[PDB]
Design a protein around this ligand. Structure first.
Ligand SMILES: *[C@@H]1O[C@H](CO)[C@@H](O[C@@H]2O[C@H](CO)[C@@H](O)[C@H](O)[C@H]2NC(C)=O)[C@H](O)[C@H]1NC(C)=O
Ligand SMILES: *[C@@H]1O[C@H](CO)[C@@H](O)[C@H](O)[C@H]1NC(C)=O
Lengths: 167, 330, 58, 46, 46, 46, 58, 59, 50, 50
């Protein structure tokens, strides 16, 4: 017998879509964390154009969209910062919406060039969006993430508040 | 992250218990944003520009008001563990301006923070017993207990508006894990004596006015997550005086103490990284550890040992050395 | 405990970035930078020009 | 023959109280139980 | 919602004391332990 | 031998009232029933 | 394209950077390691001593 | 290195005993940084310049 | 008490290590200062006892 | 045995039409949501041009 992703790769002989949702995300540093959702490859699903193996709980949207600017865009202050790779998850409506992304390497490199050099920033880009990859709302948690919530769960039972706050 | 901690994702746990997990993670995420927030002046053309600041403070034009540092003092109150540790001796600090737990005549006390400190102490008891002149038994018990103490740290503020001289011309700090930037070390500058505070703060202080004026910085005030400084309104606002810059002192078990200063040495440098969790430590627990040793002083002396109810009978050895460690949570 | 630090260091790497880099490192006399803040942006773009010549021109 | 027999009992009067026991130098550390009941019988010939 | 949470603890202070427990009508009789710690959480909607 | 026998009964007088029960430290959380009827028999030798 | 161990996950970020400029470091106190920068810049007591015995620093 | 010496990584040892191992390694790492710290004058234009110095002494 | 820094103008230089504690002495030659950069002192800094 | 889309792809060797209706649609943001209707591939249907 043979299980997992490699059963899908031998029967279909085509790669796996390497851009997957369901992972953790530090929204101050714009880095991605350990995997929160469960990724299974039981049903050998592919994208509708038939070029990537995808997990079972994930649907893709084909929007093969190319954008080309003949212009630039001017950013003369680091307060209204555009992330250019994680823009939609930083611009959420919350209390700390002004602090999201402010410890990213892409922000801290930009801020130290507008202050050291008294400068303004321009950005030109050619963006090529191919897929939108989403999660089915009936998905379950990962095996590792459930275990660490159950360890917090045990400390709340035993009235151990300082040790649950630590975990 | 706490959106996905709900009774649907966790079907093998009760309803109100996955709402305790969801609330204790929502608090931990919110604590992570608060400890990485630096309000300050963000306009680079203003003279009091705060580099290393994230959030626009809305105070970009100050008035440059010099203030009076009336000193710090800390009370202690032993709660348990008497005649063993004397926690209320190395955790007690008096005001150098009065020699007492009070502010001077031109000042008034402001309560910063009140928490419980814990340390551990240790007993060690041993007794030896011999049976039929062979088979010497020695048990060595070592009990670890937790001694607690309440402390209340206060702080003096110029509230009479007429001082002759301010007093104690310095306002820089260093912790057991921090560094005084006026020395780039965990030490005082030339001719400065430290004043102990919450658990590890040592506030460097000199009232010499001649050898202290080389290193004396303009001081702005202390504030914490519960109290504000009263040097902004003439309760409080816990913002800043205005023109000064917030800088964090240590974290006293989830609460952040901050102090204001207007050097320019504290401000610049490079951009700091994020403070990552955990911001607390796991607490101390009372323990016990025993060591029983059986010594057979002779041959022609057999011994059988059954270690527990699930073990079988076992032929004994001349030296045994059983061990046990007993922990109780709280 | 001190032989553990000889053999295993002071830290454990929890993430690495796999890739490659090509680095130029020049040393210039400190008198050469002291002209102005407009000379600085021409010293700096000269070093990036010399680096692209060195990779391309044999 | 002259003999000796001991019975040590450990009783934990509470939950939220863990215990680890290493029975001898050849045993490994073992998670303890609320009632232990070690036994020993010591015989000397003559 | 209004809630309720109970914690019953049984502590046997002695050896030479056995105990049998039948947890519910579907369970079978079970040999008891020195520390038991049953738990229950009761919720009523409105 | 001296003995002891207990019978705890939980009766939910209503619908719209859920209950979760964890019978011991080795059990998992279990969805409760309207009538429970736990039983216990405690014997001490001498 | 690579065999990885079981306990290790990878993030594909196929990112290329190219500078047309340089960067000036006129003091060895504020040193940038260029290969171990994120593990040296941690917040600690001895953050000023990290990397100061490296061959690239010395 | 002492972050990974905790009761989770070492499940076959008692609780307070893996905190003695974690504290005796935290002390050994901290001792290694202290013996390789050289405070001194770091400004090369000062007449009393301390070559072979890591940390700015402020004097 | 004192500061264990330096007098000022002098340079710290280490004497031997007495079982985990470091004894240092101050001097202003210039011969003690220069040379090459030393390597790191590697552990162990104590010896196993008798 | 073999079920689903891949039974159709092995017998016919031609791709699947990637533009399908029956999904959800946020009409404020013009993004498309989770799938509301049921998509089955039991009858191996193709378009009329094949
Ligand atoms: C080091 O750089 C300085 C610039 O600061 C050079 O000095 C200039 O050299 C040019 C070339 O002949 C002269 O026209 C200028 O008059 C010089 N002075 C200034 C202030 O620009 C210097 O030549 C360089 N060193 C060497 C060895 O070439
Ligand atoms: C949990 O323990 C704390 C410790 O003092 C106590 O105040 C609280 O009432 C306890 N709660 C329960 C439900 O046992």
């Amino acid at each position: 017998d043979e299980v997992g992703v490699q059963k899908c790769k031998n029967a279909l002989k085509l790669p796996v879509l390497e851009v997957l949702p369901g992972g953790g995300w530090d929204n101050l540093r714009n880095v991605d964390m350990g995997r929160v959702m469960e990724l299974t490859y039981s049903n050998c699903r592919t994208t509708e154009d038939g070029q990537y193996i995808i997990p079972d709980e994930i649907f893709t949207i084909p929007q093969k969209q190319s954008n080309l600017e003949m212009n630039s865009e001017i950013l003369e202050s680091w307060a209204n910062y555009q992330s250019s790779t994680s823009y939609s998850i930083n611009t959420e409506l919350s209390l700390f919406s002004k602090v999201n992304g402010k410890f990213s390497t892409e922000f801290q490199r930009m801020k130290t060039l507008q202050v050291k050099d008294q400068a303004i920033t321009t950005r030109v880009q050619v963006r090529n969006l191919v897929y939108t990859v989403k999660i089915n709302p009936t998905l379950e948690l990962s095996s590792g993430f459930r275990k660490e919530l159950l360890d917090i769960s045990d400390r709340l039972e035993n009235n151990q508040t300082r040790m649950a706050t630590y975990l | 992250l706490h959106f996905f901690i709900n009774p649907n994702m966790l079907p093998d746990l009760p309803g109100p218990l996955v709402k305790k997990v969801s609330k204790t993670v929502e608090t931990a995420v919110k604590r992570y944003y608060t400890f990485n927030t630096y309000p300050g002046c963000t306009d680079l053309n203003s003279p009091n520009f705060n580099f290393q600041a994230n959030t626009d403070d809305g105070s970009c034009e100050g008035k440059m008001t010099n203030f009076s540092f009336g000193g710090v003092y800390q009370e202690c109150t032993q709660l348990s563990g008497n005649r063993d540790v004397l926690l209320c001796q190395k955790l007690e600090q008096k005001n150098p301006l009065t020699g007492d737990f009070s502010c001077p005549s031109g000042y008034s006390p402001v309560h910063l923070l009140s928490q419980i400190h814990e340390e551990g102490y240790n007993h060690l008891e041993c007794h030896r017993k011999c049976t039929l002149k062979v088979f010497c038994k020695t048990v060595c018990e070592d009990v670890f207990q937790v001694a607690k103490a309440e402390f209340r740290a206060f702080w003096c503020v110029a509230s009479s508006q007429v001082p002759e001289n301010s007093g104690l011309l310095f306002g820089g700090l260093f912790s057991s894990k921090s560094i005084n930037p006026m020395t780039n070390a965990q030490s005082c500058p030339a001719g400065y004596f430290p004043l102990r505070l919450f658990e590890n703060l040592k506030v460097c202080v000199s009232q010499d006015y001649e050898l202290g004026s080389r290193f004396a910085v303009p001081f702005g005030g202390f504030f914490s997550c519960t109290v504000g400084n009263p040097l902004v309104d003439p309760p409080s606002l816990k913002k800043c005086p205005g023109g000064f810059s917030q800088h964090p002192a240590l974290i006293s078990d989830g609460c952040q103490v901050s102090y204001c200063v207007k050097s320019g040495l504290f401000t610049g440098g490079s951009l700091p990284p994020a403070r990552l969790p955990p911001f607390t430590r796991p607490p101390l627990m009372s323990q016990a550890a025993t060591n029983t040793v059986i010594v057979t002083n002779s041959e022609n002396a057999r011994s059988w040992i059954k270690d527990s109810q699930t073990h079988q009978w076992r032929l004994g050895e001349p030296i045994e050395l059983r061990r046990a460690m007993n922990v109780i949570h709280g | 405990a001190e032989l553990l630090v000889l053999n295993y260091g002071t830290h454990v790497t929890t993430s690495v970035d796999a890739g490659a880099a090509l680095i130029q490192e020049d040393h210039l006399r400190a008198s050469f930078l002291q002209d102005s803040q407009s000379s600085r942006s021409a010293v700096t773009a000269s070093a990036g020009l010399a680096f692209q010549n060195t990779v391309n021109f044999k």
